[PDB]
Amino acid sequence: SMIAAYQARCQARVDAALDALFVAPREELQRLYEAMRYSVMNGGKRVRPLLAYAACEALGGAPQRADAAACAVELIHAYSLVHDDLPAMDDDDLRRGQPTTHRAFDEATAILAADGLQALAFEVLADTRRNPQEHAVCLEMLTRLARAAGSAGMVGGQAIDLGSVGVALDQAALEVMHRHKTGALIEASVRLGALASGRAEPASLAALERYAEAIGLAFQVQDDILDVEPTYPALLGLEAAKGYALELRDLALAALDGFPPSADPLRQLARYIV
Amino acid sequence: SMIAAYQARCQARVDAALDALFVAPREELQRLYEAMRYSVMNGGKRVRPLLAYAACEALGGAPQRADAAACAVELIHAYSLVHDDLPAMDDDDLRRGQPTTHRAFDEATAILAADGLQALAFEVLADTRRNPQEHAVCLEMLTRLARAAGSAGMVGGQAIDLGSVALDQAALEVMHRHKTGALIEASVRLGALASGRAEPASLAALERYAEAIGLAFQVQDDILDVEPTYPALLGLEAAKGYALELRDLALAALDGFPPSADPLRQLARYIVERR
Ligand SMILES: O=C(O)CCn1c(=O)oc2ccccc21
Ligand SMILES: O=C(O)CCn1c(=O)oc2ccccc21
Ligand SMILES: O=C(O)CCn1c(=O)oc2ccccc21
Ligand SMILES: [Cl-]
What we know:
The structure is a homodimer.
Chain A: H1 2-19, H2 30-40, H3 47-58, H4 67-85, E1 94-95, E2 98-99, H5 101-104, H6 107-126, H7 135-149, H8 154-162, H9 171-196, H10 202-228, H11 232-236, H12 238-255, H13 264-273
Antiparallel strand pairs in A: 1-2
Helix pairs in contact in A: 1-3, 1-4, 2-6, 3-4, 3-9, 4-6, 4-9, 7-9, 8-9, 9-10, 10-12, 12-13
The structure holds 3-(2-oxo-1,3-benzoxazol-3(2H)-yl)propanoic acid (6H6) (3 copies) and chloride ion.
PDB class: transferase
Keywords: transferase, maybridge fragment library
Assembly: dimeric
């Protein structure tokens, strides 16, 4: 497909940029940096970088402009999964058949590596060589990532989740959890790409935000559906869940009304998800 | 010396600014925000904020200019302590007699509250209302904090410590300079940036200052514990002498600074005069 090729391009590109970030500045830090590299360079699909690049293109920006954005959102993502894997959280020994970072190294080193990955996400955005936007735009990219990654966004979502165990969530509560835990960062990926284009305007930003809201949820619905083929199918029944995923794809496509052909990657992604 | 009063003024001010950051934006996030507040609003002495304010004043800036800097360095510091307390690290039930965050709440919540505190540190610096410097200066503050807080600074120092075992003075100093020095130095740097009057020579001198006091503090601390350390490496009396040498280097780095740098001078003396 066109989307398969777009994904593969985004993945090669961001991977090359990320791989360069993990050189220990001195010998004593080698194992720390190897854990950082292990936590990031793990064959992930890089959906968040794809979204940054595609949002950048949708507004007419050359995609290399979003390199730093793409790296930052992937760094946030990766750190979040390392902390999530720990015994006090999800306690996961394996991710796609490979040991998780605390299992491959040790729990302290995993905690620290991921802590350093979060810092690096911000470092890369603030670095006007790696992220060479107008300074006001660099700051807005930082602001948006920090809000989305923190306790009002992704980390907050993780807290809502742990605070809902043993409660039977209704759909509205489930969606509140998803919008925080995964939606904030998806939205920030699109927002930061769009900002990197050097052509953002408030109307186009608001429309891309509607797009992102839609596809973020659509990812979760469809994930639950593929698991079958407190979940969307369990709440709704399998068939109504499938209908809901199509509704989300339609909201996503509608948000892109008026965009030029250079938004086709975002349209194609919305279809691919469902 | 008025250093105690300077410290108390810096503490009240930064505490007021920090306390305002822990309002949950909706109900479902209340307990997370409470754990964040619990992890920061613990009566700490706020040395890093003190440094940001004093560096700002040392360069003729009004101190409220450094409010965001002060908050950001304290947030990084507070998150680092919460993760350090965790069972996989130092495994402490107590911090100054009070239950650690993982005990008062739970381990996941401690991990997450601290993760959120790190994001907030960057949020506060990038927020041009809370940190109303020129844009280029906001970015340099962000750059410096990020580098100091991450795997090449504070987190790296934590890894070096974890990774160490049979260690010589140079290697001990490498560990300290990362684990504690980087953030101490960034506190001074950010405050100086916030003055609006930074320049390379002054920045460099303040960096020498920060290097010196960060180390002096660790030397004096080992000396007081008596009661792989500075006294064991050097002998108790040469360690005491080395603490004075570090204070002197700190004070020499501030040669030529005006009287408004007096808080930094008094702080350097205080570090080696305690007990
Ligand atoms: O599994 C693969 O390697 C290709 C699958 N794949 C694709 O074709 O487009 C995608 C967009 C986002 C994530 C995965 C995608
Ligand atoms: O802890 C007190 O209230 C008095 C001790 N104290 C002081 O007098 O100045 C200080 C600077 C930093 C940390 C502690 C300091
Ligand atoms: O972490 C703290 O707040 C207490 C330790 N501490 C202090 O009280 O004065 C210091 C000066 C330099 C480095 C650490 C110092
Ligand atoms: Cl389709």
